Design a protein around this ligand. Structure first.
Ligand code: ZN
Ligand code: ZN
Ligand code: ZN
Ligand code: ZN
Ligand code: ZN
Lengths: 220, 258, 263, 255, 245, 44
């Protein structure tokens, strides 16, 4: 990808096969789970839109999610084009106009255009915008691929609180909403949806207790 | 007991099998099998366990209980999904069959307070989740689907749903012959209960035995060893255990002290 | 005696069992069982197992149908809300599904001669005998069971919230923990033992026919060739008894092959 | 056969039991029971020929296992390297030990190779890639295999011997459900009953191809042609107008 | 006969089975089966008793086991002659079939430490010194089928496996026209059902019969004959001079 | 027997000859000719 040069001019770097192999194996292995969101951002640091498209097309199967992300990319590229004013005036040598909705996706733009945009001062964060677009697409894909809600989790009378809290936080991370609502639900549903003995224990502990205190008290 | 203790010890050292398996294979009381199992450093009641399942048919809920050792079936349709009716069925089956542990699966109606009170009154331990037996998981569902197959077949010749379901379960219990053995489920369950009664008679016979410290002598050695815990006395010999070793000695080479 | 007194008094305030049951089950001296029975304010025929007797009674304004086993005294009672032949047929098919009954003794009541009852008894192949029973012993057992069930229901009605629950608790305590006056064993144990010891002739005959259906190939001590399809009688660890043209022969297991020629 | 056919017909219209029960409880030939079942409108298995193959990883090595759909019988082996030759060898061995007609398996690389395709085409084995409820049974058997090989590894020096000992104990001395028997008794009973049923149906197929004409006590004229069902004891049992009758051989002719 | 000639030819070009095999499998008369066989240019005790032996073929050692009672065959080519692989094969065949006794010679491999340890661990009785005619006939028959299928044999192991498969399944045997697999299945099933029924009795039937001596137990009464067992000895007596209580 | 069934049936579909003629002309056993005749719907 775009790699900074030691007190020199940055040049294009070939993509290591290790990153592609690791990405495809981790994608095919477990699921479209939230843990793939950080992993992807670790495997695409400072990458051109062409590199992002190449990484995207390497996946095998599950083409429905590919269609979802392509449609979202198209709509958000249209939004970016409609919000960003169209550049006007002559284009001087060594500079390029603002990338189009198709250019940020990398479907039509070539590597030379990306290099020219990167070397332009100030640099255009086209790659970062496309990466965050892909992040949003993956977030909504994970939202679709969650076969459970947050309000339907129940704890068995003899079920330990450990896996109950584990699944509660798994569903909390699988659910996307504002942070305040997440705090409210993780403060209320945890006590409100437990076994009666630990429920009364938590009520005795009072509101605002740290989760370490409740997990130590519910033991037994 | 004709040198079967050594064979059981060798079999548990090479396999570490269930105590009841050794007891049945070598015709031994369960106590010696349990002590042999406990002797194993890496190791530490099938009748009376029932499994309950719920199904939907003709827009109505039907609850079916099935035994694990024999597979005896009971079924009933409930007008409305409430815990009171399930508790009533549980107490009726407790009052009709000897039930020791009721195993079920996850369910909102199974965790009701009424069924908990009903099972606490009867003294029956209830639980839900993975079946206790590591095998025969598919037996319950195969029997349920056989019942579902036969109820649709016998529905056309009946006037009511409940009568048809009960006739189908009666046919499955009595008028359906199996494979190995080839007899009714009632016959196998009554045989199991009879063998349970016989094993309880053996248990009370062992209860007749008590501390009864016994000293032993081996191979006519001049020394007397002991004390050793008495296990069984009969056929002119006495089988005892000591230091995780079980052995049988003739009576002429042993003494019993009150 | 190893904390058995407390558990015994708990199960007696919950069950009100007989003192023989307390002595046998919890391993306690008879004096403790007798004093536990006294402390409670609520306490003070060999034939074919196919014979059962069904009767109906009016208790507390409700109709109760009770079926009793003649050979053991086992009882099963239910509370029928509305007296109809349909519910009687329901109870009959329930008891037929749960037990291999073959003969039922009933009176000349309207619901006993219902079309549903006739259809059920014809379908299940159960003999029906209306009228007064010919055995006074069965009537005496009926009366004793009736008075005992009335007493236990009166004792246990305070604990239960409904009549059906009280009846079921009464039948549970009678069948499992209560010990009868003959032998001192529970009714359920007696009936299950009778059922276990009853199914012997049919299985014996079917096993005899099956063992006679087998085919055996055997050789003599000095004969290297095999013989014909000798019928099988008995199999042993090291010897087999077979028939070969009305001749009884005992052959060692080494020189005997047992086969069922499917073709 | 002493007027037990009418009783069997009545008890089959009542209970609708299996043909084996009808034959056993009244000493009837299998042909009579089969035709009674067929005549019933209510009434209308190749189980041993169905197997499932699964591969797992342990200690960095591949272990393959084939499991019967019914009775929970298993057979496992370790493999040095995962290619088509070892899979073909295992398939050929299992075909040489047991009769298999079809197999279900996943979409692995070794399953899609040409070697296994040729091996199964040689033996006429249907290969299906992809199972109503057998998944739970096979996964429970696999977990039992894992726990027993973990427990038995203490006294073993090589993984192959440990796997063989584990499958031996599982298939011989691990009593399961109804009857308290092992997988061997179940498999042998199933295959024996299947062989018996197939030979009985082949005998019926080769017997029924003959027509009959009989004389009765009220009409010297031969009537028919009825379907041949059974012959013996100087008589023939046949069926005409969906009614089963018996006629002495001296008053009957077969074509 | 319904298009059975074509499939009979297509299976004879595949396995080259015996005439009785395809005669019984496809329901064809024996005459046409014999004609099909001729038209091919390449063609013209106790359940626990098992016999294991070693054979040499083109610089290869092969361990071959055979069930004496049913004639079932198994074989495996051992690359380097050592007792460890013999023990491995023995434990594998034990895991695949119940064996209580093995008849071998005094060979070093058969008496090897690993083999002895495995057989003692499995509880299998050992008998040295050996019946042999049947083993030799099966050996030469399998050599004949190996020669028959060697034309399509890419490797020795596959050829041996296919020969075992065609011998055990694709060829009918003797009495009843049953293959080795059918015979072993039948004998195992009969043994299982007979032992089950034997364990069923002596739990219900327990009678004492006096003849001529002692309180013998009744074993079988009928057809004017009483067979009884006492002191581990079986005696048959006429219906007279025998009282059943 | 050497492909005689096919020629026998193809000529029987045109002429419907007696089983003896098929047996003699094509050298087939009488049972094959009889069952070939039986397979013909027109003949009996
Ligand atoms: Zn152990
Ligand atoms: Zn009391
Ligand atoms: Zn039917
Ligand atoms: Zn050939
Ligand atoms: Zn014609």
């Amino acid at each position: 990808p775009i790699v900074q040069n030691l007190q020199g001019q940055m040049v294009h770097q070939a993509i290591s096969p290790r990153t592609l192999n690791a990405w495809v194996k981790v994608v095919e292995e477990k699921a479209f789970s939230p843990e793939v969101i950080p992993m992807f951002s670790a495997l695409s640091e400072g990458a051109t839109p062409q590199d992002l498209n190449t990484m995207l097309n390497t996946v095998g199967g599950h083409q429905a999610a590919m269609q979802m992300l392509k449609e979202t990319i198209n709509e958000e590229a249209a939004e970016w084009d409609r919000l960003h004013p169209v550049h006007a005036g002559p284009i001087a040598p060594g500079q390029m106009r603002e990338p189009r909705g198709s250019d940020i996706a990398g479907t039509t733009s070539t590597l030379q255009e990306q290099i020219g945009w990167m070397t332009h001062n100030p640099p255009i964060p086209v790659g970062e915008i496309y990466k965050r677009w892909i992040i949003l697409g993956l977030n909504k894909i994970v939202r679709m691929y969650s076969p459970t809600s947050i309000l339907d989790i129940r704890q068995g009378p003899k079920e330990p609180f450990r896996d109950y809290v584990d699944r509660f936080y798994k569903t909390l991370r699988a659910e996307q909403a504002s942070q305040e609502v997440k705090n409210w639900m993780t403060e209320t549903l945890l006590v409100q949806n437990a076994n009666p003995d630990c429920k009364t224990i938590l009520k005795a502990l009072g509101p605002g207790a740290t989760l370490e205190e409740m997990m130590t008290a519910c033991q037994g | 007991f004709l040198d079967g203790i050594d064979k059981a010890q060798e079999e548990h050292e090479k396999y570490h099998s269930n105590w009841r398996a050794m007891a049945s294979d070598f015709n031994l009381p369960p106590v010696v099998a349990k002590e042999i199992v406990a002797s194993c450093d890496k190791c530490q009641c099938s009748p009376g366990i029932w499994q309950l399942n719920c199904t939907h048919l003709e827009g109505k809920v039907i609850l079916v209980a099935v035994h694990v050792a024999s597979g005896y079936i009971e079924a009933e349709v409930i007008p409305a999904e409430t815990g009171q009716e399930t508790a009533y069925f549980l107490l009726k089956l407790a009052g009709r069959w000897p039930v020791k542990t009721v195993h079920t699966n996850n369910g909102s109606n199974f965790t009701s307070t009424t069924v908990k009170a009903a099972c606490w009154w009867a003294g029956i331990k209830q639980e839900f989740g993975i079946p206790y037996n590591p095998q025969s998981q598919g037996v319950i569902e195969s029997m349920n689907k056989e019942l579902k197959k036969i109820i649709g077949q016998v529905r056309d010749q009946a006037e009511h749903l409940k009568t048809a379901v009960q006739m189908a379960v009666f046919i499955h219990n009595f008028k359906r012959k199996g494979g190995i053995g080839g007899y009714s489920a009632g016959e196998r369950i009554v045989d199991i209960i009879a063998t349970d009664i016989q094993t309880k008679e053996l248990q009370k016979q062992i209860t007749k035995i008590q501390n009864f410290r016994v000293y032993y002598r081996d191979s006519r050695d001049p020394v007397w060893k002991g004390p050793a815990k008495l296990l069984w006395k009969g056929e002119g010999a006495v089988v005892i255990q000591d230091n995780s070793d079980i052995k049988v000695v003739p009576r002429r080479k042993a003494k019993i002290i009150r």
